[PDB]
Amino acid sequence: VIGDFNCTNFAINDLNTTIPRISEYVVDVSYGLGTYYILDRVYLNTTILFTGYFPKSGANFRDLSLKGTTKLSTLWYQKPFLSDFNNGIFSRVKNTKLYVNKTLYSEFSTIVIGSVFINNSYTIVVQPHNGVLEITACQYTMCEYPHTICKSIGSSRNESWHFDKSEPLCLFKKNFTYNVSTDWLYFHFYQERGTFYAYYADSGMPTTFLFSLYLGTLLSHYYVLPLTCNAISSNTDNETLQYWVTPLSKRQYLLKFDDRGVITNAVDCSSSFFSEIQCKTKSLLPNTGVYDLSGFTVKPVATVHRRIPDLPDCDIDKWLNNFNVPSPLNWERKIFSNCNFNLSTLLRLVHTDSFSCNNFDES
Amino acid sequence: LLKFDDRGVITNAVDCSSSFFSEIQCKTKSLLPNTGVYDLSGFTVKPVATVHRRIPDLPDCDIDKWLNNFNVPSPLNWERKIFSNCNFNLSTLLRLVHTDSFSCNNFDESKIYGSCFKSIVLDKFAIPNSRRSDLQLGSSGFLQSSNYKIDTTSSSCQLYYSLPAINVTINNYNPSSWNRRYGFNNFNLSSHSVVYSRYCFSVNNTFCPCAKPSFASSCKSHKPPSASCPIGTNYRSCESTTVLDHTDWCRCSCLPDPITAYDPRSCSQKKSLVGVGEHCAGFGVDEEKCGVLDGSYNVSCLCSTDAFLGWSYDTCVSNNRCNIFSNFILNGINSGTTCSNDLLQPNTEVFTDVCVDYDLYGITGQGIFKEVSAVYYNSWQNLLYDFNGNIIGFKDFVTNKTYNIFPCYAGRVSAAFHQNASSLALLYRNLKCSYVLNNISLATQPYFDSYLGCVFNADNLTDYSVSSCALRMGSGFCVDYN
Amino acid sequence: NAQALNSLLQQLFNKFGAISSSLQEILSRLDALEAQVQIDRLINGRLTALNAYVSQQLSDISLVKLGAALAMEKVNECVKSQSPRINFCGNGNHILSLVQNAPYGLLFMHF
Amino acid sequence: NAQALNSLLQQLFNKFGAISSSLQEILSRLDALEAQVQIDRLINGRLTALNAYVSQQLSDISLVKLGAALAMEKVNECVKSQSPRINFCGNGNHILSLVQNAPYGLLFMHF
Amino acid sequence: SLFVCSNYAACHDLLSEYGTFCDNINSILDEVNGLLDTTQLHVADTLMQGVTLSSNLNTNLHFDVDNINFKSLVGCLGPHCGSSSRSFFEDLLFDKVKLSDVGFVEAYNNCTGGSEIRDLLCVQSFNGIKVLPPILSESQISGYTTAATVAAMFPPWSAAAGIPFS
Amino acid sequence: SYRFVTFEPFNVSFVNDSIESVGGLYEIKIPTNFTIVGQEEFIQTNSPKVTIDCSLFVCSNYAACHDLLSEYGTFCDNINSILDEVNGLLDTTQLHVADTLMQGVTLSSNLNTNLHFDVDNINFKSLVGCLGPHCGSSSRSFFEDLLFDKVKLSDVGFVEAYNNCTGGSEIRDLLCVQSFNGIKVLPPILSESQISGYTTAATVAAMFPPWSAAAGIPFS
Ligand SMILES: *[C@@H]1O[C@H](CO)[C@@H](O[C@@H]2O[C@H](CO)[C@@H](O[C@@H]3O[C@H](CO)[C@@H](O)[C@H](O)[C@@H]3O)[C@H](O)[C@H]2NC(C)=O)[C@H](O)[C@H]1NC(C)=O
Ligand SMILES: *[C@@H]1O[C@H](CO)[C@@H](O[C@@H]2O[C@H](CO)[C@@H](O)[C@H](O)[C@H]2NC(C)=O)[C@H](O)[C@H]1NC(C)=O
Ligand SMILES: *[C@@H]1O[C@H](CO)[C@@H](O[C@@H]2O[C@H](CO)[C@@H](O)[C@H](O)[C@H]2NC(C)=O)[C@H](O)[C@H]1NC(C)=O
Ligand SMILES: *[C@@H]1O[C@H](CO)[C@@H](O[C@@H]2O[C@H](CO)[C@@H](O)[C@H](O)[C@H]2NC(C)=O)[C@H](O)[C@H]1NC(C)=O
Ligand SMILES: *[C@@H]1O[C@H](CO)[C@@H](O[C@@H]2O[C@H](CO)[C@@H](O)[C@H](O)[C@H]2NC(C)=O)[C@H](O)[C@H]1NC(C)=O
Ligand SMILES: *[C@@H]1O[C@H](CO)[C@@H](O[C@@H]2O[C@H](CO)[C@@H](O)[C@H](O)[C@H]2NC(C)=O)[C@H](O)[C@H]1NC(C)=O
Ligand SMILES: *[C@@H]1O[C@H](CO)[C@@H](O[C@@H]2O[C@H](CO)[C@@H](O)[C@H](O)[C@H]2NC(C)=O)[C@H](O)[C@H]1NC(C)=O
Ligand SMILES: *[C@@H]1O[C@H](CO)[C@@H](O[C@@H]2O[C@H](CO)[C@@H](O)[C@H](O)[C@H]2NC(C)=O)[C@H](O)[C@H]1NC(C)=O
Ligand SMILES: *[C@@H]1O[C@H](CO)[C@@H](O[C@@H]2O[C@H](CO)[C@@H](O)[C@H](O)[C@H]2NC(C)=O)[C@H](O)[C@H]1NC(C)=O
Ligand SMILES: *[C@@H]1O[C@H](CO)[C@@H](O[C@@H]2O[C@H](CO)[C@@H](O)[C@H](O)[C@H]2NC(C)=O)[C@H](O)[C@H]1NC(C)=O
Ligand SMILES: *[C@@H]1O[C@H](CO)[C@@H](O)[C@H](O)[C@H]1NC(C)=O
Ligand SMILES: *[C@@H]1O[C@H](CO)[C@@H](O)[C@H](O)[C@H]1NC(C)=O
Ligand SMILES: *[C@@H]1O[C@H](CO)[C@@H](O)[C@H](O)[C@H]1NC(C)=O
Ligand SMILES: *[C@@H]1O[C@H](CO)[C@@H](O)[C@H](O)[C@H]1NC(C)=O
Ligand SMILES: *[C@@H]1O[C@H](CO)[C@@H](O)[C@H](O)[C@H]1NC(C)=O
Ligand SMILES: *[C@@H]1O[C@H](CO)[C@@H](O)[C@H](O)[C@H]1NC(C)=O
Ligand SMILES: *[C@@H]1O[C@H](CO)[C@@H](O)[C@H](O)[C@H]1NC(C)=O
Ligand SMILES: *[C@@H]1O[C@H](CO)[C@@H](O)[C@H](O)[C@H]1NC(C)=O
Ligand SMILES: *[C@@H]1O[C@H](CO)[C@@H](O)[C@H](O)[C@H]1NC(C)=O
Ligand SMILES: *[C@@H]1O[C@H](CO)[C@@H](O)[C@H](O)[C@H]1NC(C)=O
Ligand SMILES: *[C@@H]1O[C@H](CO)[C@@H](O)[C@H](O)[C@H]1NC(C)=O
């Protein structure tokens, strides 16, 4: 369950229909996947080392594109489908084309991003409408079991993923268009210091800037909503849905630019030894030679923590809060040894005002 | 450069900056240097004009109209307004508000006038008098550790001012959806009472601050209050045992409060810090003190107002003027559409093929412009950079014309000196005499063009052969004296 | 030589712990009080780079002088005459040699 | 060579004006604000030590190359043949020489 | 990345400003080692310029002609000159000092599993300072010197101007 | 793919012959047919002469930087002095090489070098420059043309590159940026045309009488 509002209970099965499948797909950054354009930079025919929020090469994608016809299972609204949004995600979406009455119809999944998913915390919603990308972020009163339908062919149910009879007061609401006759779309979503960022690309694998919204809080979980259409899963001869998501990380990338300013290649710079050789050489095809690679300290396998057994309490609070406070002419002194103390409790119980140190720190 | 004789009387003096010969004398620390070739630096070509480019008329920012608003909030919920695509006067803004102090870190006062920024981020909250000293940089006080963290690695400006005590309302509203979910209403505090949080706690999405009613029915000694939180939430970790004098004693987690819990590891709510650009995570609710006694799957989970704790409040009044904090966050330095107009300068069209200083929308420096026609700039792409952080061309905002920025000439000048001659035999290497004449300096001495460059104060007679020259300039050319 | 000059040129874009590798940004962001420590860091780093470069240049030029002395002996003993030294001019039974000019050196063709 | 490596190893335990010569104590006593200046002092001192070491290594390897060229001429002119150079191979009236392998060099036994 | 900053993230992040110094240091050491390798190759090549050996050379039995003993100077006496061509004379030289290239290899080999802590080579190797073996092993150079000596010995007397040694 | 093998760069040449004196006689391979082969060798005599100044490199045109550099001015004086003595040593070495190219050289005045160039059936036309009496402009030989066209960054190349720096439309060149940042490669005190003329004179004196460089005897 993703919300707390009970909208409806039609066509639901919960009799342990346990067939969840998460597909995998290796991440190939070596042609421009997961790379975005800098906001005001043009580089021509050069190779630049750049650090940014990037997907990790050699990892795996994750196909969260659910698909249903009538039934809504209860296993579609828990982990691992209700996934983890810790720093940010990079998305790769298939653009499903439906040919109804010799007319193109593009439709794919709807992604929601939030923290708690109730109507006192904001929720970023991205939802297409036949080539128009609606990106809104308000306090949506989303249902316990969300739902998305197919505009080209109506399914057995109506669309029901929020109960906002009146538009809630909020911050961001905008419309975006794109080339509706495309095959794959790429999305960068990440957050940094309380501001939510978003990058977009439709034609070409490198990504460009879209917008940036400030929220004031953090994002915790994202979820790809299930879609219900009838012309898609018709005897599995037609097309399907592919929504591939990978987590983001702050790692150095090596990028290559051509004469037009388009990113042609990318290197992870930390995936393997070969990538590290490429990033040290600042090229993609280094000359024949022997290279020495450092950073080869063996990782520890365990931790040992030794303390002397149970020692009496120091009672620093009981001496500091004594009722006989002396003058600076005769300052007192009490030496503490062979005793354990809690610094947080000691700071809390006495009515402190300031506590600073020199040549040493608090942490 | 001064010379003293045996009596201590100054006999000679050198200007050290009048001419090349004086510079040779001052480098040599003598008046009659030996015969040789000297290289003299400090030969960057002076700019001949200035080009200053600004975006045309943008609306006023009205920073004064937002700073002097009559609804000042708490450090628990600090407001923020982002300013872009607007022009501002810093002097008028500082003057009209009743400022007291305005200091900055990693950036100064004098470089704000006539400068461009991508955006200006401003945060505002009232200062309680008890925690006034908490706002100093690097101090880990209750304001800096639970309400508002000040970044120290970013170019920021801190502003202190005050509004008159009347016409002031205090907006108290905690931005914690977790606290609002389990029954937290508005505050009950007097006017000019500024509330600040002392500890912030973060929980997971599946939190539920109530006990299981089925387990609550079995608990007969110290039975906790029970309710019914919505689905997807795991209940409390209350478990029953025997304390060797009671048949059934059941204890719960976070006894008695998350602040003073003897076992914080098993407690779900954890004490947390706050990052820059983020609010307080929440208020640690007392688990046992809140709830409904004997609630069996019929009452949703709510908690009392007094259950939430870990905050104290004070007042803003100091000599009938409530002091207000402000924090300027300047990002995108020397680039962007938000420029200051205190150093007012009319817009100047871009010149071509002349060494001029430029102020192209915040980017400063000097260079030579050569206009070309290249269309690799997209809608967002607007500046062309070298492979390591160097501007090598841009595209104008208004005229959409592609330009290139080339560096100005910064060569050196040679000087051939002989002891018997009081003059110099100069040599500007790899140059032509026409470029030296009109673009560098006029010739008061006979100049000629040679293979190595343009030679000054030495006639061109490269037909004779000399088998011994003490003044060699290279490639078989020597400058003797006669 | 081109690589050495390129490395010395790339030494100009090192931060050395300062806020910016370029003096223009420092002088346009700081005013003569905290600017001075950044400028001192840049100056100390660039002076260290220059001292390392001139030491390496001294070693390289000493090696060049030694090779040129070898070339002078090679001209004296193999081209203008034939000293009875086995395998000094060329590998195998030497006959004579001829000298031709080369970019930064000479070219010997041992027959 | 052992003394040079030992000196370079002992360079790692110099305070250079910092509170501790080891990075573990500094990173366990300071938190990224006053730690940075101490780590900068340690880095600058160790980089100066490395630059001095590589300059001395360059000079030593140049001397080794010159000695090896002398060894090549000694092999060419004293072992395989006998050039008429007085007191080049050995002191006194020379007869012949033989070459044997040695650790980091050759061994010439002049007779 | 081992000497200046061993395994600490803050030190490695602060070292990124001075990364050009590290690239220069590694490049200088690389060209120094390349010069050393070229010099070793030139010495090995000039050890054999006009050398010429005979196939019918069973060096285990004909080793002392003209009443002169070169058994100690000539290695791999016989037809098994594939394993170790080191001569008896070089045995004293290579046993008087133990820290040769083979000594360095055997010392760095005995570094992972051991009960001794006062050795300096293991500490140096763990702190990024390591002495790599040369591109030619001393067994090959010993075989080269043996080949030169035998060429001076027997017909055709390549290293002795085509004439009997006596 | 990657094969890990042994590295044996040098080995002896074997000859199937007896190693014993039968009948008082040994066995050896006397050559019966011969040829003349050649081999080239390049020895580096000169190096580029680089000059670096603080008042452009460390501090380009900024008053505060130049004022702060006054404390460390002794370092800049030492750097300039060290580079000056390095370039002086290079110039002295070049002069010594040019002098030792012609020690006892002696040419004939009646030497019209364009028509009499190959006597005794040996061609020196490619090795001898300025064929004729016009040896004032360029004495570079035909043999040196391949050498000086294979590499373009000679001293003449540096001069032509620094010349084409003030007026142009190209920005990716490194030499202009280096020269504007105070790093510049000055031409040597002797041009390579003069050294080519010296080598040509040495070769001709080795060939034609009086045979100064060939010990007073015909070359064949
Ligand atoms: C913000 O979200 C909360 C949480 O969902 C909303 O409160 C919930 O509102 C619904 C209907 O508005 C309530 O459902 C009702 O339940 C009674 C029980 O007898 C039933 O008879 C009604 O027909 C209806 O289904 C629900 O109880 C209530 N509380 C919870 C915990 O879900 C709230 O309305 C939202 N606010 C806005 C402005 O949308
Ligand atoms: C883009 O950069 C490449 C690489 O520097 C350029 O290719 C070089 O072109 C020059 C022509 O002057 C050749 O001498 C080099 O050998 C080329 N190098 C490689 C690796 O190909 C290419 O010319 C540049 N393109 C443009 C339009 O300037
Ligand atoms: C963004 O574009 C979409 C599609 O054109 C808009 O959705 C329609 O809005 C109209 C009202 O303007 C409604 O009558 C339709 O029912 C909507 N269509 C669907 C499929 O919901 C949307 O309103 C636009 N958003 C904004 C902010 O202009
Ligand atoms: C202060 O800002 C204003 C606009 O925000 C600048 O523009 C002047 O505005 C006044 C009225 O607000 C007009 O009467 C003037 O004609 C405007 N132009 C000029 C050139 O004064 C104003 O210049 C700014 N102040 C300063 C000192 O630059
Ligand atoms: C410079 O380029 C910008 C970016 O395209 C132009 O801004 C828009 O251009 C489109 C088509 O070129 C017009 O339809 C829009 O009306 C323009 N926007 C506005 C607000 O006018 C801009 O017009 C270009 N400048 C010119 C052509 O002088
Ligand atoms: C430069 O000055 C020197 C020093 O006076 C000149 O050398 C003198 O010349 C005069 C006149 O010929 C003689 O009487 C002196 O005996 C010379 N002194 C020495 C120490 O040589 C020199 O002639 C001047 N001119 C040049 C071209 O060097
Ligand atoms: C400095 O040099 C530049 C070019 O090297 C000169 O610019 C051109 O000068 C010619 C000669 O009068 C004019 O016909 C052109 O119109 C000029 N071009 C431009 C773009 O202005 C420049 O005149 C020289 N400086 C001076 C003072 O003469
Ligand atoms: C510098 O002087 C030389 C020597 O006279 C000049 O070279 C002569 O130039 C004229 C005119 O082009 C030619 O007819 C002669 O044949 C050249 N003689 C030689 C020996 O080269 C040279 O032109 C002069 N340079 C300047 C700028 O006046
Ligand atoms: C002359 O030839 C005779 C061959 O008979 C050599 O005599 C042999 O010398 C070897 C020493 O290498 C001894 O081991 C043999 O026992 C000798 N055999 C006989 C039959 O005497 C003799 O050495 C040769 N002369 C010289 C000066 O070497
Ligand atoms: C001996 O002298 C004769 C002179 O007649 C040489 O013959 C000439 O050789 C040149 C080669 O440089 C040819 O170009 C001529 O055509 C030859 N002339 C005749 C008449 O044969 C001959 O080359 C000399 N001998 C040697 C070995 O050089
Ligand atoms: C949710 O609502 C549906 C109709 O909208 C209703 O049939 C169902 O009983 C509700 N679920 C509850 C009350 O748990
Ligand atoms: C969709 O809404 C219509 C509106 O009348 C309703 O008749 C229909 O039953 C709904 N579909 C469902 C609940 O699946
Ligand atoms: C949309 O993408 C398709 C993909 O092949 C392309 O052919 C088409 O030209 C694109 N549309 C536009 C308007 O560029
Ligand atoms: C403050 O409020 C009083 C009373 O409402 C009013 O007279 C006065 O003008 C107000 N001051 C300002 C600055 O608005
Ligand atoms: C809030 O404060 C006012 C004034 O002190 C008081 O009259 C009122 O009862 C308080 N509200 C509650 C719920 O106690
Ligand atoms: C909270 O969730 C995190 C994962 O986001 C998990 O690692 C942790 O154990 C959870 N803690 C509690 C008390 O549920
Ligand atoms: C380690 O093993 C090597 C053999 O490879 C041996 O020479 C050496 O002495 C051993 N080290 C010790 C301390 O015994
Ligand atoms: C010996 O060297 C020659 C030439 O380098 C080579 O052709 C031959 O194969 C070598 N013999 C070996 C490696 O046994
Ligand atoms: C040398 O030649 C002889 C005569 O043909 C032959 O008997 C002998 O086997 C050869 N030895 C070799 C090829 O090693
Ligand atoms: C020597 O070789 C040449 C060609 O290589 C040939 O013409 C000539 O007849 C040969 N002479 C002998 C004696 O073999
Ligand atoms: C500049 O002119 C010189 C002739 O002095 C020429 O060799 C060079 O190629 C030119 N440069 C360019 C980029 O054309």
Highlighted features:
363 residues; binds a molecule of 3 linked components (NAG-NAG-BMA); 3 helices; binds 2-acetamido-2-deoxy-beta-D-glucopyranose; seven-stranded antiparallel β-sheet; part of a larger assembly; binds a molecule of 2 linked components (NAG-NAG); mainly beta; five-stranded antiparallel β-sheet; 6% helix; 6 chains
Strand content of chain A: 25-35%
Using the CA coordinates, give the radius of gyration of chain A: 28 Å
Work out the helicity level of chain A: under 10%
Largest interface: C-F, 55 and 67 residues
The end-to-end distance of chain A, rounded to whole angstroms, is: 39 Å
Q: Regarding quaternary structure, how should these chains be classified?
A: part of a larger assembly
Number of helices of chain A: 3
Total number of strands of chain A: 19
Pattern of helices and strands of chain A: EEEEEEEEEEEEEEEEEEEHHH
Shape summary of chain A: globular
Q: Which kinds of small molecule does this entry bind, naming each only once?
A: a molecule of 3 linked components (NAG-NAG-BMA), a molecule of 2 linked components (NAG-NAG), 2-acetamido-2-deoxy-beta-D-glucopyranose
Largest sheet of chain A: 7 strands, antiparallel
Derived from helix and strand composition plus strand pairing, the structural class of chain A reads mainly beta
Disulfide bonds (chain B): 16-26, 61-86, 104-157, 116-339, 200-280, 208-229, 210-301, 219-250, 238-252, 254-267, 290-303, 316-322, 355-408, 433-454, 469-478
Organism (chain B): Human coronavirus HKU1 (HCoV-HKU1)
Family (chain B): Belongs to the betacoronaviruses spike protein family.
Glycosylation sites (chain B): 89, 167, 188, 204, 298, 400, 420, 439, 460
